[PDB]
């Protein structure tokens with residue numbers, strides 16, 4: 001484990017995702033509202049999945065070597081197995097908050113799968129220049145997601161209860177800022193141009209992951225928007 | 232790229248799926264009917280997924296070598312990753328058109344997963360004679376799907392609006408004819424008996440894919456069956 | 463095939479899953495109740511999936527070698543591909559029986575995915591002591607599932623029709639007893655401590671699989687709880 005300088009950030013990430021999972025699990029014990037139960041189930045699964053994948057990276061299972069640039073490059077593939085399941089769950093939290101229609105939910109989840117799937121292909125591609133073709137396709141899929149979150153959901157939240165509109169607006173802004181950083185870290189990190197070393201890259205993804213999952217969840221599950229209007 | 236004679240058909244397929252995706256995306260911009268939005272989302276995702284997998288084959292990522300018959304045989308595995316997601320989406324288009332019940336939808340999607348999954352196992356199997364055992368199981372799963380589309384959905388469409396009944400009947404006939412060709416191309420192509428060479432096999436799958444996805448989508452999204460009855 | 467002593471139990475399992483699939487398929491022909499169709503579709507898919515994965519193990523495709531303990535250990539990875547899809551389908555049978563809320567269904571299916579996913583990682587892990595870390599995480603996920611089936615569903619079934627309450631109680635008890643045996647067989651078998659040899663381990667999993675899928679299905683599909691109350 002300790003033979004890799006980035007191990008400290010993988011261990012911290014593992015701990016923070018595990019602690020986040022347990023807090024949400026305990027906090028959700030005393031909840032019977034069927035609407036609130038939906039948000040607790042979605043939001044608790046997110047850091048639980050991330051916990052297992054951070055642990056796999058810490059123990060060395062989620063790491064492979066990819067030859068490109070005449071070098072064997074360490075690629076943590078477990079990140080994409082994490083994101084494949086956690087990013088659509090996070091979008092479902094937002095879509096259920098605004099009572100989005102089914103067709104829009106399917107478009108979001110499908111574009112998200114394309115985003116993560118093409119990012120994985122780009123991470124494992126051995127022809128250096130082709131890695132950035134996949135990065136560009138994946139980034140186009142992300143821009144579609146961000147467009148929908150702004151010019152489809154925002155207008156839908158305003159016609160909703162005030163507390164669900166204000167909570168959505170906050171979580172929307174958090175998501176757009178944090179998610180946009182991921183393609184940048186990829187491009188300048190060891191998967192892309194190799195400007196930033198792997199140990200610093202790992203620290204950046206850990207800060208982003210914890211903020212986008214645990215921080216996101218703390219804002220959502222403390223809001224009254226997750227409960228139905230009741231007397 | 233150009234070192235493979237089949238590259239021209241992979242490049243054409245990539246272009247036609249990309250163009251198809253963009254047309255459906257633009258055409259769906261001016262749509263607010265929640266029913267129509269469902270069909271546009273399903274139908275636009277189909278060629279978008281196929282685009283990415285054709286590109287992976289063009290660039291050489293979606294290709295592996297499988298030893299059988301005393302030879303290293305080029306097997307494009309990316310086809311099955313495509314079909315795993317696009318064939319159930321196409322069946323969902325048909326099932327939603329006739330307002331199929333949930334139990335029937337689950338049976339269709341499950342049989343479809345078995346069809347594609349066993350076809351993938353057959354494509355990667357190293358014992359030559361066993362490849363055709365998997366082909367037979369996969370073909371049995373397809374025949375179940377075709378039976379349901381005829382002796383379960385057809386009777387349901389007649390009790391529906393006339394425009395949804397006539398549109399379903401057309402898309403049903405297109406699907407049964409085109410899908411039935413796939414097991415035949417597999418059997419006589421490089422995955423099976425090896426009668427037809429890979430470059431011709433690739434041309435045939437490209438014609439079938441574009442027809443079953445883009446051609447299918449053009450018929451559906453030009454129909455009024457996708458809109459609810461409104462004044 | 464016959465070069466492996468466990469082949470006899472893989473062949474028996476294949477036959478019993480295939481026969482089970484055909485019986486459920488025939489029995490479900492004469493069913494039009496939309497509620498009953500749901501249970502028949504879920505319950506017939508379970509042994510059909512298991513059939514294909516037992517066949518892959520029989521023919522040698524679903525087997526790999528994992529080095530640990532200074533030895534190349536035969537690991538049947540196809541079991542986890544089976545369980546990944548069949549265990550959530552079995553939980554869906556139970557959840558639909560008691561009309562569970564959506565949030566609870568998602569929590570069950572998500573915990574089940576974590577259970578199977580971490581068990582697969584543990585089966586393929588090359589550092590011997592780490593294999594049991596994954597076993598423990600997977601077992602914690604199972605205990606969560608069992609808790610929900612007892613202290614969330616049981617109370618919900620009592621407020622239901624008497625026949626659905628008594629049928630659920632029976633299937634609940636069958637599930638908790640049979641599922642609990644799996645982590646024990648893993649721990650003492652070739653994936654874990656290696657006390658029980660592989661051929662005996664394979665026999666035990668076959669008895670458990672057939673009972674948990676075909677036996678489970680025979681109890682459910684003979685009950686009147688799967689039909690709506692009708693005159």
Ligand SMILES: CC(C)CCC[C@@H](C)CCC[C@@H](C)CCC[C@@H](C)CCOC[C@@H](CO)OCC[C@H](C)CCC[C@H](C)CCC[C@H](C)CCCC(C)C
Pocket residue numbers: 084109110113114117118120121124276280283295308311312313315316351
């Ligand atoms: C509606 C939305 C959900 C739609 C989703 C969008 C999606 C279509 C976007 C594209 C996804 C696609 C790129 C997934 C590729 C997975 C692949 C990286 C797995 C590893 O295989 C890659 C190479 C080794 O580098 O295999 C070496 C050769 C091996 C012999 C490969 C044989 C196994 C194949 C991988 C079998 C295909 C399985 C499916 C891809 C499983 C789904 C994985 C997940 C990442 C989507």
Ligand SMILES: CC(C)CCC[C@@H](C)CCC[C@@H](C)CCC[C@@H](C)CCOC[C@@H](CO)OCC[C@H](C)CCC[C@H](C)CCC[C@H](C)CCCC(C)C
Pocket residue numbers: 315340341344345348349351352355507511514526539542543544546547582
């Ligand atoms: C309700 C419906 C959706 C049900 C679906 C029906 C489905 C059950 C039908 C059978 C599907 C099954 C054959 C999928 C097999 C995937 C497999 C080809 C992936 C590549 O692995 C094959 C060998 C190399 O040749 O791995 C070499 C050895 C490696 C060490 C393998 C270890 C990884 C395992 C593959 C882990 C299992 C992952 C799941 C199979 C992922 C789903 C893939 C998709 C193709 C279903």
Ligand SMILES: CC(C)CCC[C@@H](C)CCC[C@@H](C)CCC[C@@H](C)CCOC[C@@H](CO)OCC[C@H](C)CCC[C@H](C)CCC[C@H](C)CCCC(C)C
Pocket residue numbers: 045049052064077080081082084085120546571572575576579580582583586
């Ligand atoms: C809501 C719920 C459904 C959530 C589900 C819970 C889930 C997150 C729990 C953890 C699942 C995770 C451990 C799955 C790992 C699959 C992995 C074993 C496949 C084989 O790859 C392992 C190594 C060889 O040993 O690959 C060698 C290196 C290769 C180069 C690997 C590159 C391919 C990657 C495997 C791509 C990721 C694909 C996804 C993991 C596909 C889903 C598989 C299924 C088992 C979940």
Ligand SMILES: *C/C=C(C)/C=C/C=C(C)/C=C/C1=C(C)CCCC1(C)C
Pocket residue numbers: 083086087090115116119120135138139142179180182183186209212213
């Ligand atoms: C909890 C994890 C989250 C919210 C991860 C989000 C990840 C992304 C938005 C990743 C995007 C990428 C691109 C847009 C292209 C480059 C490759 C990716 C996958 C890093």
Ligand SMILES: *C/C=C(C)/C=C/C=C(C)/C=C/C1=C(C)CCCC1(C)C
Pocket residue numbers: 314317318321346347350351366369370373410411413414417440443444
């Ligand atoms: C857009 C792609 C489509 C509609 C693909 C359809 C593919 C099939 C219907 C494939 C069927 C197969 C068999 C029936 C057995 C032989 C292997 C397959 C997977 C080619």
Ligand SMILES: *C/C=C(C)/C=C/C=C(C)/C=C/C1=C(C)CCCC1(C)C
Pocket residue numbers: 545548549552577578581582597600601604641642644645648671674675
């Ligand atoms: C039809 C198959 C069924 C119902 C299989 C159930 C399997 C389990 C409940 C497996 C549980 C495991 C653990 C709890 C940890 C050890 C590894 C597993 C996956 C065997």
Ligand SMILES: CCCCCCCCCCCCCCC
Pocket residue numbers: 181184185195196197200
């Ligand atoms: C979206 C965030 C990207 C900003 C990356 C900042 C990295 C600064 C760290 C110093 C770079 C290390 C280079 C010298 C080793």
Ligand SMILES: CCCCCCCCCCCCCCC
Pocket residue numbers: 016019020023210211214215218
């Ligand atoms: C009462 C609110 C705080 C509860 C404690 C939460 C502990 C989980 C770890 C959170 C750290 C990361 C927060 C986002 C920066």
Ligand SMILES: CCCCCCCCCCCCCCC
Pocket residue numbers: 412415416426427428431
């Ligand atoms: C379902 C369509 C299958 C028909 C295949 C027709 C192939 C004819 C092309 C000529 C065969 C090439 C053999 C000589 C190289």
Ligand SMILES: CCCCCCCCCCCCCCC
Pocket residue numbers: 247250251254441442445446449
């Ligand atoms: C107005 C209808 C035609 C629009 C142009 C569609 C261009 C997408 C490519 C379609 C070619 C394949 C059609 C099926 C044979």
Ligand SMILES: CCCCCCCCCCCCCCC
Pocket residue numbers: 643646647657658659662
């Ligand atoms: C949950 C069931 C686990 C019980 C396992 C009993 C196995 C007894 C078979 C004899 C053990 C073989 C050891 C000598 C070869």
Ligand SMILES: CCCCCCCCCCCCCCC
Pocket residue numbers: 478481482485672673676677680
């Ligand atoms: C009339 C009920 C029996 C029908 C025959 C079922 C045959 C399928 C194989 C069942 C054997 C396994 C039963 C569970 C132990």
Ligand SMILES: CCCCCCCCCCCCCC
Pocket residue numbers: 315316319320323333336337340344
């Ligand atoms: C194995 C991959 C299957 C999933 C394909 C994605 C489409 C799923 C459609 C689900 C239809 C709704 C069923 C109720």
Ligand SMILES: CCCCCCCCCCCCCC
Pocket residue numbers: 546547550551554564567568571575
């Ligand atoms: C990782 C594979 C999980 C999918 C298994 C297929 C069954 C899914 C059941 C979904 C139940 C409906 C939830 C609302």
Ligand SMILES: CCCCCCCCCCCCC
Pocket residue numbers: 139143146147150180183184
């Ligand atoms: C185009 C939709 C408007 C909202 C999206 C904001 C774009 C942020 C740019 C992200 C940069 C990634 C490289």
Ligand SMILES: CCCCCCCCCCCCC
Pocket residue numbers: 370374377378381411414415
């Ligand atoms: C048996 C259901 C009737 C409709 C299915 C038509 C069968 C077409 C044969 C396809 C040939 C594939 C080898």
